[PDB]
From a paper:
[name] family proteins are thought to mediate directional bulk glycerolipid transfer between organelles at contact sites, where organelles are closely apposed, effecting membrane expansion and organelle biogenesis. In yeast, Vps13p localizes to multiple contact sites in part via the so-called [name] adaptor binding domain (VAB), near the C-terminal end. The VAB, with no significant sequence similarity to any previously characterized protein domain, interacts with a Proline-X-Proline (Pro-X-Pro) motif present in receptor proteins at contact sites. Receptor proteins include the sorting nexin Ypt35p on the endosome, Spo71p on the prospore membrane, and a multipass integral membrane protein, Mcp1p, in the outer mitochondrial membrane.
Here we present the crystal structure, at 3.0-Å resolution, of the VAB from the fungus [name], complexed to the Pro-X-Pro motif of Mcp1p from the same organism. Although we were unsuccessful in crystallizing the VAB domain by itself, we did obtain crystals of a construct comprising the VAB of [name] Vps13p (residues 1,944–2,635) N-terminally fused to the Pro-X-Pro-motif of [name] (residues 15–32), [name](Mcp1ct)-VABct. The VAB comprises six modules of the same topology arranged end to end to resemble a fishhook. There are two VAB molecules in each asymmetric unit. In the second copy, [name]-VAB1–5, we modeled only the first five repeated modules (residues 1,944–2,516), as the electron density for the sixth repeat was poor, most likely because this repeat is flexibly positioned with respect to the rest of the protein. There is strong density for the Pro-X-Pro-motif fused to the N-terminus of [name]-VAB1–5 (L17V18E19L20D21P22A23P24I25A26E27), showing that it interacts in trans with [name]-VAB1–6, binding on the acidic face of the VAB at the conserved interface between its fifth and sixth repeats. Residues L17-D21 form a short β-strand alongside and parallel to the fourth β-strand of the sixth repeat module, with the two conserved hydrophobic residues (L17 and L20) packed against hydrophobic surfaces. The two proline side chains (P22 and P24) are buried in a groove that runs along the interface. A prominent patch on the surface of the sixth module and extending to the interface between the fifth and sixth modules is highly conserved across fungi, indicating functional importance. Further, mutation of an asparagine residue at the C-terminal end of the first β-strand of the sixth repeat module of the VAB (N2521 in [name] Vps13p) abolished Pro-X-Pro binding.
Numbering used by the authors:
A (entry chain A): 3 to 12, 20 to 37, 53 to 69, 84 to 404, 413 to 560, 568 to 593
B (entry chain B): 21 to 35, 56 to 68, 86 to 113, 125 to 228, 232 to 250, 253 to 389, 396 to 401, 414 to 611, ...
The structure:
């Protein structure tokens, strides 16, 4: 056999060298030589401190670097030339893997918060020469070389394959102390009009005085615009710059987000969408960013008209990227999404407070597409009306109550049956938190697990309907009464119907047929009836 | 399968000799009835297969009862129904000689006929039970007078106090035997029903026959009144015991013939502070009663405070008479009227509907000067059975936790340093919660140097397993059952007395180590917990962090790692390990499904 055990449970450092020089790290016995850009694990087999010497830098070996606390600790490189005090920054981050990541670098950091590879170049602006160039992956950061961050300037460009040149201005920390926020312009090598845009924000602690004497900054590079699609459909979008009059076309799936590097935030630019697979036309342009010269208020809504002409008022959410220096995300969403899960084709109308009732835009027939829904204005007194099949229109229902289940009883046309629906209104899960999801369901659903086919009938009614084994079916039309009931029979002729059982009484109920267990359980405004053969002892 | 009731006023012979007033069974399909000493011939060819009223004047009533037996009452076509609650004596009166012939008792609910032959010539009189000491009816009950005036008040003076019946006579207008085929129903003139959640003492006043009448009525109770006449305008006044309400003013429950007072559809009670409550009065006319009716005092809303907090309700003024159930009304009857709730030290709520029949809503209350919220569940239903006109509004906690672990436990929201104790066998509402879309909880054994568990989502309905351990002790599995009753998510914490969902079975000659993969934003609380699986061993495992979306494990051997899932059946994808002696080993990985348990088998290839 095997040894049965109880389920009880059971290189702590990783050092990277981003200094621009080869380093030698020795404990205060064990040595590790690291090239520039390489990382290696580290363990201590004085206390828990190391000593770092930058090879070929002309700097003394920094002693007594304790690696136990986390944060950014600055050490003074000892041969000061002319009151220059160059600093080595040791950054320690305790990651989620319970491993302290240790970065040896200069205090100037460049953060790539874009989705593409960015090349950072070390530039001598007096000589016109690019000393070195390092690549930064998306979501990563790289520093200027140690020592060179004080004297040399910086340039950024995208990945060469994109054929965009270096930034037309430099990234100089003494200029960034007075002007930390800057749009970085990169001209194209294939089109004079084509111009890639970065947006740079520089940030530091305003209490540390060393940033007035040394580049102790972080330089975050972002996309100036990000477009998120939280509709339940895809769209093709069209960005128009009012200045110099360019238009850029692209595609965006449901749930997706895309960065744009083709617009500058000093220009007024506009968004237009054309939703795919939906009875709506292309939208008009809405102002998603104003310029420094223009004074347009940016649009909070986006109108799409269907093929009949009725409007749908989508909403635009703006989120400023933190530490981004004015770069933002725009999100197109529908304020309501109605899910028709009744099985019957459902018409939805919108009625205002003092306004009249109008039909909803883009209503199709069922297999049921999700229906984007908005009111004509943003009143809390606005309500909606529902119609299921050949039923009468509903009472005014509220789609604003977050986390609510409501029974809706519809009287029906030319008969005395009634349709019973369950309406759930929730907020969308995760990133769809600003979208109110309205599920329309039948209130009663019966499911057959008896092993064979069955016939069901409400006992105040001569109208019977079958139900196959393993098939679920809703119970739409019901006869009027306070308590709702049902009866079962086998499909053989001259078999007898059962006693009536209340289909709204939650719990288990036994029922003899010529023992059947009916369990009755509510789930998201829908009472589910489950029929089964009782495989236990009878209660009497 | 037959039962014959001889109510003819004579003795009959059925071909069974049945005397007058005696019932007897019968089987066999027709019979013949001889009325002995009546001066009539033998009625024969009496079919007993169909139900109804058949005339031969002689009447045979056949009723197919609940015990599917053929009830066969032989009678005259003049029947007196006792639909009152007391025993009624019926007398056969000869008004030309002042002469009472026979006296027949009628129990409540049943009916008794006039004698055959004497119905067409002699009049009738009713009275109550002679233990009540009330005389006969002052007027006579003559059916020719009832053919023109079918509805009357029957008055009975006391023998040392006036008793009243309401008589209505009904018949088929298309019957050819008009001018005595009729039914004479006797009802109480008034019935008062209490559908309040408190008892009251009531008092009936009247303008004519100035006579106050005081009595008591419990909750859910109904009482007939025989001391008033429907020709009199009379008034009802209630006073509820064990309430903070005072006595009510008199409202008009019956108008007279000569008066023009409107019948009050409402009844206002006032509390000890002066705030009003508008109870409603439902009137139900008794069918074929001749205008006798039932009045019903009910509250339009009953608010049940099941939260455990002190709750105030306002109506858009404050509610009157503010756990006992709270009767609630609005100032008027508009569907745009809403209410506001306050619970404890929280702000007032959004406008809530008490008219939304069959609804469960979640109400979130921002508390005063702190960033915690109170989460409530509001359920609005109609009452059960006879309470269907009352709207019942239950205020409940949104979340309730229940300890069935056997030991005491401590609970904590994972974004909070504030922990709450929880004794064994104790229900507790989770009122105050931190803000956020995903509400979570953590458990810990009491005492320091004990670690908290992984967070689990308390809004995800179903079964969730959670691993817990004391300091230096082994792990035990907690079953967390999360179920929604009605605006109340009950969390039940028990110790799992079932095999664990996973069994790591290392059949190979290689020591492994396994851990749950980092999902990364996340709210699983993932920390590194590695387990050692020595060669030829087995150990049950439950997810270390059940709040993760994608859940896989990572097995590790000789600085090699392999992610494997734990729900699929696997694909026997082997893992190649480079051993320090220079050779290579190959570990086959399979997942079998033993019922609810998924077993991971690592073998040698």
């Amino acid at each position: 056999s095997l040894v049965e055990l109880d389920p009880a449970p059971i290189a702590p450092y990783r050092i990277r060298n981003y200094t621009g020089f080869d380093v030698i790290i020795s404990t205060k016995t064990m040595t590790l030589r690291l090239e520039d850009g390489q990382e290696a694990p580290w363990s201590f087999e004085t206390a828990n401190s190391i000593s770092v010497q930058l090879v070929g830098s002309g700097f003394q070996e920094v002693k007594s670097i304790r690696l136990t606390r986390e944060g950014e600790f600055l050490f003074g490189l000892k041969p000061k030339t002319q009151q220059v005090l160059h600093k080595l920054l040791v950054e320690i981050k305790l990651g989620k893997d319970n491993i302290k990541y240790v970065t040896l670098r200069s205090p100037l950091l460049v953060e790539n918060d874009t989705g593409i590879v960015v090349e950072l170049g070390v530039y001598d602006a007096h000589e016109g020469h690019l000393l070195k160039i390092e690549r930064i992956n998306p979501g990563e950061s790289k520093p200027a070389p140690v020592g060179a961050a004080y004297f040399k300037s910086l340039l950024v460009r995208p990945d060469p394959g994109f054929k965009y040149g270096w930034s037309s201005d430099t990234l100089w920390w003494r200029d960034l102390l007075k002007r930390p926020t800057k749009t970085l312009v990169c001209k194209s090598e294939q089109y004079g009009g084509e111009v890639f845009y970065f947006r740079l924000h520089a940030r530091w602690d305003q209490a540390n005085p060393l940033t007035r004497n040394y580049p102790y900054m972080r330089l975050k590079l972002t996309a100036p615009l990000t477009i998120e699609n939280l509709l339940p459909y895809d769209f093709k979008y069209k960005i128009y710059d009012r200045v110099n009059k360019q238009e850029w076309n692209n595609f965006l799936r449901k749930g997706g987000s895309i960065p744009v590097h083709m617009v500058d935030l000093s220009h007024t630019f506009l968004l237009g969408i054309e939703m795919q697979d939906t009875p709506f036309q292309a939208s008009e342009f809405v102002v998603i960013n104003t310029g420094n010269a223009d004074d347009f208020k940016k649009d909070s809504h986006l109108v799409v008209k269907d093929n009949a002409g009725m409007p749908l008022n989508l909403r635009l959410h703006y989120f400023r990227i933190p530490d981004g220096g004015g770069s933002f995300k725009v999100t197109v969403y529908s304020p309501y999404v109605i899910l028709n899960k009744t099985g019957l084709d459902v018409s939805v109308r919108s009625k205002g407070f003092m306004q009249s009732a109008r039909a909803a835009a883009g209503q199709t027939l069922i297999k049921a597409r999700p229906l984007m829904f908005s009111f004509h204005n943003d009143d809390h007194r606005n309500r909606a009306l529902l119609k299921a099949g050949d039923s009468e229109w509903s009472k005014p229902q509220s789609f604003d109550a977050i986390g609510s289940t409501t029974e809706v009883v519809l009287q029906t046309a030319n008969r005395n049956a009634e349709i019973h629906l369950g309406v759930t209104v929730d907020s969308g899960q995760g990133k769809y938190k600003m979208v109110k999801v309205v599920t329309l369901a039948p209130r009663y659903v019966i499911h057959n697990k008896l092993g064979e086919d069955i016939n069901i009938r409400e006992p105040s009614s001569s109208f019977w309907i079958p139900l196959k084994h393993g098939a679920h079916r809703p119970l739409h039309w019901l006869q009027r009464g306070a308590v709702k009931q049902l009866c079962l029979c086998y499909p053989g002729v001259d078999n007898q119907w059962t006693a009536p059982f209340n289909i709204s009484d939650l719990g288990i109920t036994h029922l003899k047929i010529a023992l059947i267990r009916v369990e009755i359980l509510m789930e998201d405004a829908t009472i589910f009836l489950n029929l089964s053969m009782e495989q236990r002892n009878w209660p009497f």
